[PDB]
Chains A and B, each alone.
Chain A
Amino acid sequence: ELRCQCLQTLQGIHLKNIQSVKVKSPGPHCAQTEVIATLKNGQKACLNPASPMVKKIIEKMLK
């Protein structure tokens, strides 16, 4: 869809619950960066890309 997927971002998402994280850069679909975590149960959670906790979670995953 050519629209922002995250109308609000969620708090309290833990690394242990995350299966994957998708980072989508700005463009025609959305002028803001969007971060969507897919949890181990299949839930999708929109995350604040600016958040220092979100940056820490993604860098922890890369190790």
Chain B
Amino acid sequence: QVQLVQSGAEVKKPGASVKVSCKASGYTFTNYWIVWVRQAPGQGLEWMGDLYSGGGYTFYSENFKGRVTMTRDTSTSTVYMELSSLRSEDTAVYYCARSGYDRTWFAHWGQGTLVTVSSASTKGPSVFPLAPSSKSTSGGTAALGCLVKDYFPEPVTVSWNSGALTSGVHTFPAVLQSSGLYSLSSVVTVPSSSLGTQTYICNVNHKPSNTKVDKKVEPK
């Protein structure tokens, strides 16, 4: 029941700072280390530093020393990583992880936080249904989905029926449009027999623009 829950995706301008949280539960917080690892394009995984949750030790990578600060709060079982003097090249997914028996291995990981650094304007998506019809039904299977268009930056997350529908879902990687905005689709295949009785809602979240949309996808 060990869980590390990180704060949501963020967008920042160059020169700003970002502070990502990592809230721990399901173990004695003060007995372990929390480490920060970032995953940036072409650089696989990179250790940023770590700190012992019970106090006394904080270590930073020489690649970030001078602009990274890691702090801990025993009352909330939370660790924070603040990265200052942001540059567009700091765009990456930032993970926290808890140590195992020692800080040499990372037993449990947070879900990651995508931080995008850009001067471009944040834009919320438009969500359109991909309705099941005679042109998306064959062999007893129906396909339906949502088109999540014109947003910036990444990520958009999509769930179906508030996470109750996961089988047969494909949420595609986003494409970059000529406008600099992204678009993605999320589809699901279901029985064509029950389009009249089942309800399919796509739940779209774009944390950088504070957009949360639930779109019921009805047969056409």
Kindly report which residue of chain B lies nearest to residue A5, judged by CB atoms: B102
> How long is the Cα–Cα vector from A26 to B28 in the complex, in angstroms?
12
> How long is the Cα–Cα vector from A35 to B52 in the complex, in angstroms?
22
Residues of B within 8 A of A30 (CB): 101-102
Interface pair A28/B56, CB less than 8 Å apart: yes
> How long is the Cα–Cα vector from A46 to B103 in the complex, in angstroms?
20
| Interface residue ranges of A1-49 to B (CB < 8 Å) | 2-4, 26-32
Residues of B within 8 A of A32 (CB): 101
- Size of the A side of the interface (Cβ < 8 Å), in residues, is 10
B180 within 8 A of A: no
> How long is the Cα–Cα vector from A48 to B75 in the complex, in angstroms?
34
Interface pair B103/A2, CB less than 8 Å apart: yes
Residues of A within 8 A of B101 (CB): 4, 30-32
Kindly report which residue of chain A lies nearest to residue B52, judged by CB atoms: A28
Main SS class of interface, B: loop
> How long is the Cα–Cα vector from A26 to B54 in the complex, in angstroms?
12
Q: What 0/1 pattern do residues 96 to 108 of B give for CB contact below 8 A with A?
A: 0001111110000
Kindly report which residue of chain A lies nearest to residue B54, judged by CB atoms: A28
B94 within 8 A of A: no
Q: What 0/1 pattern do residues 141 to 168 of B give for CB contact below 8 A with A?
A: 0000000000000000000000000000
Interface pair B102/A4, CB less than 8 Å apart: yes
Residues of B within 8 A of A3 (CB): 102-104
In angstroms, how far is the closest chain A Cβ from the Cβ of B103?
A: 6
In angstroms, how far is the closest chain B Cβ from the Cβ of A36?
A: 15
Most buried by B among A30, A31, A32: A31
The 6 closest A-B pairs by CB, nearest first: A28-B52, A3-B102, A4-B102, A4-B101, A31-B101, A30-B102
Residues on B lying within 8 angstroms of A by beta carbon are 31-33, 52, 54, 56-57, 99-104
Please name 7 pairs of A and B residues whose Cβ atoms are closer than 8 Å in the assembled complex, sorted by A: A3-B102, A4-B101, A4-B104, A27-B54, A28-B54, A28-B57, A31-B99
